[PDB]
């Protein structure tokens, strides 16, 4: 924990040169709902388009209740109504998603830690060895009673949601819940097992589309060694320490390794790929995979 400066300049161009130097072998991405908004899944805290500005109609106490396990156990219907409203007709990962697929294909991706539940990382070609779905997934669902715990695929959970029938276990008639980690629930064991080992060896943190306002996910940025560069690609800055409360430091006089590239995640990953000589690879990959999905 000695603060050395490994980037020759605190810019995207400097990150790029660093990524193609020998020091940079193991990349961890930390991603949130910002990387899937351009796919038609709204985020939470964007004013106007975010979910928190769009929950008046669910008769809830307050907005946050619809993502709390307690409230869900009492009343699962609002969440499942919300689920129907948000369920996209087509699952098409973004440029940002395929950028992380490129890191994998190039041997650079040590892990992607995602707060998203939309499965778009899997569809882009990230495999369980690449992925920590820190807040679970809609891909599988389980009977909640410590008894059945029987598993149902997304195909079955989707039908329940669209036919507006609350999912019950065929074997025990208990409620069937998407494998999502609600607020107040414990994160999967794989989250902790990976983070204890992944952050000993990481050479670059790539943080994309997340307000870094959910714990313990947001604490991941402080797990990297102090000389590990950290690039944020996001609409606005995030992860700086409150002036009253190892946060991000892009702007202070002591800034030495944090870089904030401000804009759309799709645009930031495009710009980074160009610097890397990957732009055509990335365009070809996105066009081919979107074409394949468009023809499903």
């Amino acid at each position: 924990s000695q603060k050395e400066r490994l980037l020759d300049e605190l810019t995207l161009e400097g990150v790029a040169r660093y990524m193609q130097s020998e020091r940079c072998r193991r990349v961890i991405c930390l991603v949130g709902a910002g990387i899937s908004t351009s796919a038609g899944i709204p985020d939470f805290r964007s004013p106007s388009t975010g979910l928190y500005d769009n929950l008046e109609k669910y008769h809830l106490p307050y907005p946050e209740a619809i993502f709390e396990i307690s409230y869900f156990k009492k009343h699962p219907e609002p969440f499942f109504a919300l689920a129907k409203e948000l369920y996209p007709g087509q699952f098409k990962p973004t440029i940002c998603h395929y950028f992380m697929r490129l890191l994998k294909d190039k041997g650079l991706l040590l892990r992607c830690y995602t707060q998203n539940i939309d499965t778009l990382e899997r569809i882009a070609g990230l495999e369980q060895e690449d992925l920590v779905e820190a807040h679970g997934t809609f891909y599988t669902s389980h009977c909640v009673s410590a008894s059945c715990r029987h598993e149902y695929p997304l195909s079955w959970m989707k039908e329940k949601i669209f036919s507006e029938v609350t999912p019950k276990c065929e074997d025990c008639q208990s409620l069937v819940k998407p494998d999502i980690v609600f607020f107040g629930e414990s994160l999967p064991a794989r989250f902790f097992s990976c983070m204890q080992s992944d952050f000993l060896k990481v050479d670059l943190l790539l943080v994309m589309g997340t307000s870094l306002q959910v714990q313990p996910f947001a604490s991941l940025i402080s797990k990297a060694p102090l000389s590990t560069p950290r690039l944020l690609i996001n609409k606005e800055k995030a992860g700086q320490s409150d002036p009253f409360l190892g946060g991000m430091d892009f702007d202070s006089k002591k800034a030495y390794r944090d870089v904030a590239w401000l804009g759309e995640c799709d645009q930031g990953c495009l710009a980074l790929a160009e610097l890397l000589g990957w732009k055509k690879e990335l365009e070809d990959l996105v066009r081919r995979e979107h074409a394949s999905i468009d023809a499903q």
Partner: peptide
């Protein structure tokens, strides 16, 4: 610990 806000 548990998934929390703030």
């Amino acid at each position: 610990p548990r998934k929390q806000l703030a």
